[PDB]
């Protein structure tokens, strides 16, 4: 009741609040280094997206017959509700918004330049890792308790908790990579002061280690399947899933070099390294492709049901979400290799591009955890 | 649900908004006749206003133990609820807020100058007069019939329904002070076309009608007096309710003078006119405020109510509720009086102090509205 009404007014103003932050943005300016506010802006956005979108998905858990509790092992008694979750998230897009907008405006304020963002991540951080037993309490510690089993991918145990999160944090890619330009950008001048023109000295240290980066949340990944083979002797599933996030390194560090081949690459053409990097892609793409829709979804069934192409049982009422469901994947999945063209072409270029499609990479994350769902539900009901 | 979702979202959007459009006022201006602009404005301002205000009410009559249908006389059947209400009046408020929007950018946007104000009375006018059996329509078909009523004051029955909206009318003024400048504003040029400076010849008639729209909205009031004590032959509360709107008109053709009389005038004081003026405003403030404090509310019981100064019996659980409303309409019902103070001390000045006052002015109706049916509630609770 009260609570719904909140999350509205906070997505009203989320909504009205992006707007004037897009129109500030093209016309006002984003300041002196642009490319330095937008990659701190980035990751905040994306982790924002996340979260609202886990509290839609939530909620479509709910009104479907899901047992969200029992998947995740949380306690029946204590479940973050949709509505909360979208509260949260609603909240803290208000006050991104509010800071970016502080950020275009530093001058008029008086406020200085940096700021704002570091505020940001001042309260994100101050809530989430939140010593006290305020709201929310039992919900954060176990957050962390995972992202920890996570990033101690090989050694821990391998939950469906650790699964999810792990490929939420393998869609989530930018703030990875964001980090090292913030430790970068924040080593070399502080703020409550702008710029010095050294702010143009971290992008220039062209992210040698990004690959490292890029590669680590897939790399989690990695290592948790390589645990799971480790414990269970079975080794199809988790070999095959393994040997994609393989092709993904591979695709990740081919990539560089294409980038990074200055010399004897005038003519793209040239310099036979790309077009390798292509293929690996389009082979990756492919390849991580039919994997989800084939085990991740269950789609496409021997068991022959009449649904079309689809597993004889569906959780969702319309069978159109499905439809919907695949081609979404298969266009989004297939935008980083669709993506370069841009690039290539002289069109809009660099960093901007891998801001642009970052949120409908999430959003097809989102639409992955959808059918992930309706696929281990209707798996732990056929088995029980 | 859904609904509710809907209202906050539509009520974020107009705070934000709402907010934008007043810094753009400030800042980038309001056009070539700011004060076309504020009189086209004001009314649709305060009809959305009103509309929101009586959800947020008709909400409060519904947590409380106040019997909403029998005392408006409505089918039991039919019931805007007060998350329809709310919605409308959001949506409403959204779209204002982007036809003022309009305004302000007609020249980067291209569009002509006086459209967005024309379009919003065009979708105001079609919704309410919408002819059609689609949604909301029995609430329209009633609007429409009470506000008949209340226009057609002397010759038709009085009902519970046509005091309330008779009042209503008397609090949102500014509309009748508006109408005939629309009038003027629309027979003089029309849009497609920006102004002319004969746009700065409709405010030069100095609203020599203005006493007759201004009293208009309080002579339905007093017309359903004198067709009250008409038909029931008891003559105490219908003639003093009378005779306080008698003093209203007072007040209201006294300024005129006031304000008319530029000769013999220089210096305030002089022109014994004004010392008149202020005395019948203080005597009606006063009248006004006791009589509402009084019979209105029943507040002040001689039946010696231990709940101080208030009744035995009252509905809302709280008693600050009570104490803040006194305090607000003493302030509020003396806002007039103690108003004209600012224009006379050479700060803000003319019709913009009537702007900035009016949407305080509907909020203590809206006070007046909870307090008002609660004591209608429990007058018809004590009679059975």
Redesign the interface.
């Known amino acids: 009741?009260w609570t719904?009404?909140?999350?509205?007014?906070?997505?009203?103003?989320?909504?009205?609040?992006f707007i004037?932050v897009v129109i500030a943005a093209m016309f006002y300016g984003f300041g002196e280094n642009w490319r330095a506010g937008m990659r701190m802006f980035r990751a905040p956005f994306l982790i924002i997206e996340c979260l609202f979108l886990w509290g839609v998905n939530v909620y479509g858990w709910r009104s479907s017959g899901v047992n969200h509790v029992l998947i995740f092992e949380l306690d029946p008694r204590n479940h973050l509700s949709e509505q909360n979750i979208m509260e949260v998230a609603s909240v803290f897009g208000v006050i991104w918004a509010c800071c970016v907008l502080s950020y275009i405006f530093c001058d008029p304020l008086g406020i200085p330049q940096y700021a704002a963002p570091l505020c940001l991540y001042t309260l994100m951080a101050a809530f989430l890792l939140n010593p006290t037993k305020t709201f929310h309490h039992e919900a954060r510690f176990w957050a962390i308790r995972i992202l920890i089993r996570v990033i101690m991918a090989p050694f821990c145990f391998v939950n469906f908790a650790d699964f999810w999160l792990a490929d939420q944090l393998n869609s989530m890619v930018p703030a990875f990579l964001d980090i090292p330009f913030l430790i970068c950008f924040f080593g070399r001048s502080p703020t409550w002061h702008k710029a010095g023109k050294a702010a143009s000295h971290c992008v220039e240290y062209v992210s040698l280690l990004h690959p490292i980066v890029a590669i680590m949340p897939a790399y989690f990944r990695f290592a948790q399947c390589i645990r799971r083979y480790r414990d269970t002797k079975e080794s199809f599933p988790h070999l095959v899933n393994a040997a994609k996030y393989a092709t993904s390194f591979f695709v990740v560090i081919f990539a560089h070099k294409y980038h990074t081949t200055t010399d004897t690459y005038p003519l793209s053409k040239e310099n036979p390294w790309f077009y390798c990097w292509i293929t690996a892609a389009i082979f990756s793409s492919c390849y991580a492709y039919t994997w989800d829709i084939k085990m991740d979804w269950g789609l496409f069934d021997s068991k022959a049901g009449d649904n079309r192409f689809l597993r004889e049982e569906i959780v969702y009422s319309s069978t159109w979400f499905y439809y919907f469901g695949i081609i979404e994947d298969l266009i989004l999945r297939f935008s980083w290799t669709l993506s370069m063209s841009l690039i290539e072409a002289g069109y809009i270029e660099g960093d901007v591009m891998m801001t642009i499609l970052s949120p409908l990479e999430v959003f097809r994350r989102f639409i992955w955890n959808y059918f992930r769902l309706e696929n281990e539900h209707l798996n732990n009901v056929a088995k029980f």
């Open positions: 009741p719904t009404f909140k999350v509205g007014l906070f997505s009203g103003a989320f909504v009205v609040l004037t």
